[PDB]
Design a protein around this ligand. Structure first.
Ligand SMILES: Nc1ncnc2c1ncn2[C@@H]1O[C@H](COP(=O)(O)OP(=O)(O)OP(=O)(O)O)[C@@H](O)[C@H]1O
Ligand SMILES: Nc1ncnc2c1ncn2[C@@H]1O[C@H](COP(=O)(O)OP(=O)(O)OP(=O)(O)O)[C@@H](O)[C@H]1O
Ligand SMILES: Nc1ncnc2c1ncn2[C@@H]1O[C@H](COP(=O)(O)OP(=O)(O)OP(=O)(O)O)[C@@H](O)[C@H]1O
Ligand SMILES: Nc1ncnc2c1ncn2[C@@H]1O[C@H](COP(=O)(O)OP(=O)(O)OP(=O)(O)O)[C@@H](O)[C@H]1O
Ligand SMILES: Nc1ncnc2c1ncn2[C@@H]1O[C@H](COP(=O)(O)OP(=O)(O)O)[C@@H](O)[C@H]1O
Lengths: 578, 367, 379
């Protein structure tokens, strides 16, 4: 007792314990257990960081304050330091000697309570070249006789996995569940605790700041539990605003600072648009339309979803956007998404649904069940989302995956959460789910038989409905049906590819100019409505790169200069030179 | 009473210690009661309260505030889920029979299978029921359980395997919250082999995880939501007259769920589609939620009545239930609102009025 | 890393659980970030709150060395804890935070360095900086809820191109002193860009610097005839090629000749069907001339025609003439849908998982090769 436990009453007398607020029924039942005749040993079990240790030390704090029923008055709770207890037990019997001496001291006191934090650790305290003769059994007979009182604290998992193993020790304690408090209890706890943090960080918290901290930590941080994550938000806000007086920012911590802390912790695009975040969102449709020609309404839908997200009008809990892009090949379905990722400056999560042809490939997405060979790997999808919570999720050619795999995205779109094999949950509320497919293509490109050609516009939707279950479609933000590229779009695509080729050549230090009629001839040569834009890339490659490759590989353009490409009219041929 | 209740509701210790602990805690409680000198005998009510607090289960509460909570539960839910009253009625009656003590022997509070077209309040009624009771909500998306060997994920890996020390998720959750609402979403999309776990649970209210530990489901409401049988109900027959395909819905459900599984259910509540007035109420609900979102930004909003009617007429889709209304309201309101909140008039200001003209059926905006 | 360093400093000055956790992919610079915080403290490039603070890198080996005689490890650990508590101005840096969840005494196996430290961290008594990769974190560290709760998660993200360029600029003098070689700015930028484009198995601030160091080391092995030189873009290209398997600038050698006479060297082996040799040579030339695709295979060709016309022979001869391996797959063996699992592997939890995929592994082992799909109509 001299130097192995710390007097918690002494701490509360010197203010070393943060004050216990609320927890009325919990502490009342802890006292009730303490007042039993036999096995008066309460065990505080609960989630990690919900106030179990807080309750245990707040009992002694209340004793010092005297706001306790007049049966635990003058009782002194001591926190056991197992670490220092085991320090010098090098020789046989030292541990048992010191432990039993402390035990008889506690027996003689008849007023003290021994609080053992993380009591699940005492299932072994030294069997070094020996048997079960450690503290796990030394403490057993004293509890059953009701001579001493011990308070335990452990999480549900550690309890179930370690403490429940020894039924003899397990039955000597009274399990008490410390549940996570609700909103009002948490904000009141913060109200009672924040004087100390204001003192430590030399700041002031507004009431709205505290309420916002509570609500945001609730709806944005799903890693931890309320009474600790809220005060963590508070502490980090205090520290940040305390580091600001380098420019003499002696002021209160308003709501905006709380949102800064929450966004920097949860890695979310918060803190209201502002600065230029507004400029970037404003001309995003432009920066995309200059790289994706035609199919502008897809860019419109994407930008509207992103803005609604940043404007605070997003969904309560859903991905930023859940889009199904369907249309013929080579019309920019994946390109608009990749360019959106590059424009926003965030991560692109590309997944090739063609690799998920079989039903049993779901385990590749979410991980293998426990006990199996691939358990230690987790799942690819959820791991990627957890690593990059703010990103764009691209699922290429979802019609190629097994029709059953869609049921994962079902829950992902509905709730924005996905649980891997470890019970961990990925947060999809900050991702844009975009799925590309060629579903309605073959049905729209059909030939009517009869004297009257029919309207086949609805056939793309018919095919998509036949492929995707009604509940899967019912969770999509919108289905943007892409149309084929028109000839002016083809000219613009040819120009974009010319710019790409020019960049490639500038890398080699040579310049290229292509006459306008040459561009027109290339467009008229390569245009194929049924195949979109890839034939343009092919024809441009064949017509320009191959002659250019020969010219620069074999001397004529080695460290060359200007490439002179123009079109003649008699043969529709191109010119070349240095 | 101490003996009987410690037997029936404590299953972690052995009888000669269970009863002694019940009696000792009752004595300590009656000894702490006389802070106002109420040194009394231990009545049956005190023993019942002690065991209920030990078993973490609800006691007799026909007088407390939760009696009123149960009194107005059906209405406090009907204000959030419009139509489909029979589901709310069944849920509330099951919760009452459990709380009234006139419950099932050792079964869960209620075992209900919710089936019907998508986009209706099958899962939403469950979320709002968990909120209205203030009890934990355990959500399990059975779509993550397509393979038959994912049962190991539910109940844990057998001893002598890599995933043993983690334990099952379902049993661990129920251990953490013995009084909760258990939501199993899209169970027909899980592997049909998984249904046998639910067989065992529904019949006995107990479940043994990998550690031989038994989870107690007697105080957990079991609600499972499916979209099974919907294809037939909405499938058009060929002929001059269409048939009620509800018989086909029943046939499909029986195809998917073995006879004993259907026998271990409290009821199968067939959710209906949403009517037009129900659509109007849904529009009102979503507009209220949008108004809350805007007030978070400091923007008041007023939407006219005929604008509401026009939104409902534009978004009404019988096949998809209430979900299309979300998109309709989204595009028709949030888009101009997002523009005005980002690079427009509604930056730190509100008073946005939306009204419908009759020449173009368009919306008004602005300060 | 001023943003991340500022986040770390903000975390350290907190009242409770003021223990930042540097989480990031390997090679990103987590250990580098901690030791550079120490370095800037030495140079005073810190806010006054962290000034005059001493960071200690905790060694686990020497801490557990010889800790027989139950209590030796505990006594030693508590002695370290007491020295740090008395210092009141020290931060303990644990390079591998996921490795302190076990400290022997498997009998019972509970009183380890993890449970020994939780009271200190929860009380805000001591400041410790951790570091771990993402998978180690999520599979080893975060499993201990109470320990993960006492640490503040900081994501150390992969830097950008220009950030990498500046990092290499700042690190260059040490590599110069080590190799006695000098780097040109164009060479550094080329190293960064080529490492991004062609090296796929590492992350920027550890693979661009890898190219820099290896170029310096090889140019240090050039003065066997005393070829004293600075590192130009050419050496960088050679280095990045030794991993990408195709040099871009070495084409100024006889590689130009091999390209030029390739069509003929094939025509002497494949008679007729000149169109195929022409197409293949044009594709390979466009690739080697830098005009090829930046994210596509060198060439994707479907050869169709009657039997015995040289469809398979021309590809084998092309592989021979180029000196590259022939990744040969017969699509008649993949006549069934489920056979794709041979090419890509089985999902986790299934019998063939640890084997991997045939095609992907063959491609990874041979980054530069010709892929032949015999009888594709049979798959
Ligand atoms: N009633 C309370 N009053 C004030 N703070 C509380 C209360 N309950 C919890 N806390 C906060 O939680 C922290 C203490 O956590 P607690 O001891 O409850 O969990 P724990 O013992 O750390 O759990 P584990 O052993 O799983 O880590 C304190 O920093 C405090 O801010
Ligand atoms: N609107 C467009 N503007 C510019 N380039 C385009 C456009 N549409 C297609 N492309 C070209 O096509 C390539 C990408 O095509 P994309 O991935 O969009 O096709 P897709 O719609 O996915 O068809 P599939 O799924 O069948 O491949 C780009 O390299 C780009 O040059
Ligand atoms: N009765 C209702 N009242 C109000 N809103 C409803 C109702 N039914 C559904 N909704 C809307 O639908 C959303 C919840 O959908 P839910 O999860 O119930 O779909 P579901 O029944 O699972 O369909 P599926 O299983 O086919 O996906 C809520 O956001 C809510 O706005
Ligand atoms: N901020 C930085 N400035 C310059 N170089 C850095 C920086 N961060 C990392 N590096 C480079 O990375 C190397 C050190 O690796 P670092 O400590 O960053 O990660 P690590 O210790 O390898 O991580 P782990 O411990 O997980 O393996 C150094 O050689 C250095 O060149
Ligand atoms: N055009 C050709 N020139 C020279 N040899 C040829 C030609 N076509 C076929 N052969 C010979 O016939 C054999 C079969 O050629 P291959 O291309 O593999 O046939 P397939 O097209 O059926 O795969 C080869 O070994 C090759 O030597």
């Amino acid at each position: 007792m001299e130097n192995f436990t710390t007097n918690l009453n002494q701490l509360a007398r010197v203010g070393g314990i943060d004050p216990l607020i609320g927890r009325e029924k919990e502490l009342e039942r802890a006292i009730q257990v303490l007042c039993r005749r036999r096995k008066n040993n309460p065990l505080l079990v609960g989630e990690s960081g919900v106030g179990k240790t807080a309750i245990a030390e707040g009992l002694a704090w209340r004793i010092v304050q005297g706001d306790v029923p007049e049966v635990m008055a003058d009782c002194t709770i001591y926190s056991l330091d197992i670490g220092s207890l085991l320090a010098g037990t090098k020789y046989r019997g030292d541990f048992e000697k010191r432990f039993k001496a402390l035990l008889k001291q506690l027996e003689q006191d008849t007023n003290s309570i021994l609080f053992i934090d993380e009591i699940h650790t005492i299932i072994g305290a030294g069997a070094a070249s020996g048997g079960q003769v450690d503290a796990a059994n030394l403490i057993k007979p004293l509890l059953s006789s009701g001579k001493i009182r011990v308070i335990g604290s452990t999480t549900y998992q550690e309890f179930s996995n370690i403490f429940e193993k020894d039924r003899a020790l397990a039955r000597r304690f009274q399990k008490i569940d410390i549940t996570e408090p609700s909103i009002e209890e948490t904000v009141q706890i913060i109200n009672g605790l924040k004087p100390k943090y204001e003192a430590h960080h030399d700041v002031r918290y507004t009431a709205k700041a505290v309420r916002a901290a509570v609500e945001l930590a609730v709806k944005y941080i799903n890693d931890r539990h309320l009474p600790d994550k809220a005060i963590d938000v508070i502490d980090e806000a205090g520290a940040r605003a305390r580091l600001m007086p380098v420019s003499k920012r002696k002021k209160t911590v308003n709501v905006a600072d709380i949102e800064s802390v929450v966004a920097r912790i949860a890695r979310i695009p918060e803190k209201s648009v502002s600065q230029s975040d507004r400029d970037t969102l404003k001309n995003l449709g432009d920066r995309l339309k200059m790289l994706v020609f035609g199919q502008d309404k897809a860019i419109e839908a994407l930008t509207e979803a992103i803005k609604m997200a940043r404007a605070g009008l997003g969904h309560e809990h859903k991905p930023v956007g859940s889009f199904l892009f369907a249309g013929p090949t080579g019309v920019g379905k994946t390109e608009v998404t990749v360019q959106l990722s590059k424009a926003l400056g965030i991560e692109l999560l590309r997944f090739d649904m063609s690799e998920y042809m079989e039903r049993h490939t779901v385990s590749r997405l979410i991980g293998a069940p426990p006990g199996y060979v691939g358990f230690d790997q987790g799942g690819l999808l959820t791991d990627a989302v957890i690593k990059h919570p703010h990103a764009v999720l691209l699922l290429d050619e979802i019609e190629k995956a097994h029709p059953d795999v869609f049921n994962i995205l079902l829950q992902v779109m509905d709730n924005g959460t996905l649980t891997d094999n470890n019970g961990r949950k990925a947060d999809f509320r900050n991702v844009v789910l975009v799925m590309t497919t060629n579903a309605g293509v073959r049905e729209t490109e059909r030939k009517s038989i009869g004297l009257i050609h029919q309207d086949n516009s609805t056939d793309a939707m018919e095919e998509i409905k036949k492929i995707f279950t009604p509940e899967f479609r019912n969770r999509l933000d919108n289905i943007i049906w892409f149309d084929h590229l028109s000839t002016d779009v083809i000219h613009q695509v040819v120009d974009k590819f010319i710019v790409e080729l020019q960049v490639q050549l500038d890398q080699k230090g040579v310049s290229l100019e292509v006459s306008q009629e040459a561009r027109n001839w290339l467009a008229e040569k390569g245009y194929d409505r049924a195949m979109g834009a890839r034939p343009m890339a092919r024809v441009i490659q064949d017509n320009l790169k191959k002659p250019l490759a020969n010219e620069l590989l074999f001397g004529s353009l080695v460290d060359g200069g200007q490439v002179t490409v123009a079109l003649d009219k008699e043969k529709n041929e191109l010119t070349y030179g240095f």
